[PDB]
Design a protein around this ligand. Structure first.
Ligand SMILES: O=c1ccn([C@@H]2O[C@H](COP(=O)(O)O)[C@@H](O)[C@H]2O)c(=O)[nH]1
Ligand SMILES: O=c1ccn([C@@H]2O[C@H](COP(=O)(O)O)[C@@H](O)[C@H]2O)c(=O)[nH]1
Ligand code: NA
Ligand code: NA
Lengths: 256, 256
């Protein structure tokens, strides 16, 4: 029935980026994505180096990096290759296809040049994916579609979520999975990544809501936890990352 | 019943940014927003200078400007003040509140420092607005909510559109209107801006769909047309802008 990450990495219809990710998840016993929500390049790189062994993925918001340069991203790639994790820019492309292709390839960030994965909202219709994939397919990249959100009042529910699943499953040459709160596709080739995760109950004062790794991986069937402040705001970010890694990994093993 | 732009600028509940815009629209007889979808700063600035007298607003995507600097945006502000138009960064904020506040204030673009207006998708729930307004209210800025999209397969329909209207009307200290294809709010204090506009029928090969100024302003009741390629790709962008300005202005007068 359910397959391990290592077996999912071999599925006939697996995308190469998903396969690479699934293999390193199994090798390293990690299904943790660090949300590296910092404004300094030095802190980003120090976190990537120290936490690299503990993570399958590092998620960026490079538009909050006060001292972004392309050379910072070259350094990040070196760490990603060393420690074996993917880089996911959480850009939330959400425009018409003709615009998003330029936002993905160009400008000062040149996201496609360094991000293994990006994500998109499905609200514009499938042209958002078609535009991205024109840049992403030649660059051998993957994309995640936002099927659900963690925040209070999210409209990514019901028929909207179903539309995201259909759009992913119809663009499988580029779309490798979802941002979601739970398993939303029954096809094991697709990844499920879940933000809004902390060990303790709570939220923030701007609509964020938290659930635990056991809830999201174990009871809701997601694959990967995305954790920002639960790690970033801790004193010892390495031990915090290890606590989240162990939590998510055991929840995965026990559902398997 | 229906009020002119100049009278709407005086409504009791008008936002100061909306009032400023409405007054210059009436003064200059323009309800045209140029979508300055170019990758070179020199072309952006040359368009802003030449077309400034013809437009009420210049819409940017600064993340496609290959040679962005904050000094480019200082030059753009000088032109906006000279010719009297607002600057609208079409960033489509679409994250949780805690993230979007940092994307609006910070990073290399420092959007809030130069953009009169920004926009947001409503899919995350109202925390997206609450996060933005924490930066935007002290900086005396305004925001547009994306209630409908012009592209094929858009999911911004039905209950989603109604949720966008409610979210705007409940955050009127910061939200001044909508991106929409038609009038969606019955409250005249809110602006309606409509992309997907060309004089001729057609679309693009990535899901864009076009309607004419007479259709969108006259028959659908919107306030402002947003025009990119219909102007940008023309040989004489000034005459193209004048054709779109005259079309949108007459459609407004005839519905009034
Ligand atoms: O539905 C979503 C989609 C994305 N994020 C992102 O995931 C991270 C959550 O951070 P934290 O709340 O763990 O600090 C942030 O970067 C945020 O932008 C969410 O929180 N919820
Ligand atoms: O529903 C929407 C929202 C925004 N835009 C933006 O408006 C402009 C349309 O350009 P064009 O098709 O007139 O060239 C682009 O910058 C695009 O990103 C749309 O086209 N449709
Ligand atoms: Na883990
Ligand atoms: Na006009």
């Amino acid at each position: 029935m359910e397959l391990s990450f290592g077996a999912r990495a071999e599925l006939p219809r697996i995308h190469p980026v998903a396969s690479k990710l699934l293999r390193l998840m199994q090798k390293k016993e990690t299904n943790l994505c660090l949300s590296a929500d910092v404004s300094l390049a030095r802190e980003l790189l120090q976190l990537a180096d120290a936490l690299g062994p503990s993570i399958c993925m590092l998620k960026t918001h490079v538009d909050i990096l006060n001292d972004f340069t392309l050379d910072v991203m070259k350094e990040l790639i070196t760490l990603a290759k060393c420690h074996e994790f993917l880089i996911f820019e959480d850009r939330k492309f959400a425009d018409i296809g003709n615009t998003v292709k330029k936002q993905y390839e160009g400008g000062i960030f040149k996201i496609a040049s360094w991000a293994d994965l990006v994500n998109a909202h499905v609200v514009p219709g499938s042209g958002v994916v078609k535009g991205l994939q024109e840049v992403g397919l030649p660059l051998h990249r993957g994309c995640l579609l936002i099927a659900e959100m963690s925040s209070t009042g999210s409209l990514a529910t019901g028929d909207y979520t179903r539309a995201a699943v259909r759009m992913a499953e119809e663009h499988s040459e580029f779309v490798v999975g979802f941002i979601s709160g739970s398993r939303v596709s029954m096809k094991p080739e697709f990844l499920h990544l879940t933000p809004g995760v902390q060990l303790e109950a709570g939220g923030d004062n701007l609509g964020q809501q938290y659930n635990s790794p056991q809830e999201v991986i174990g009871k809701r069937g997601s694959d990967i936890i995305i954790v920002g402040r639960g790690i970033i705001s801790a004193a010892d970010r390495l031990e915090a990352a290890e606590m989240y890694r162990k939590a998510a990994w055991e929840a995965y093993l026990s559902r398997l």
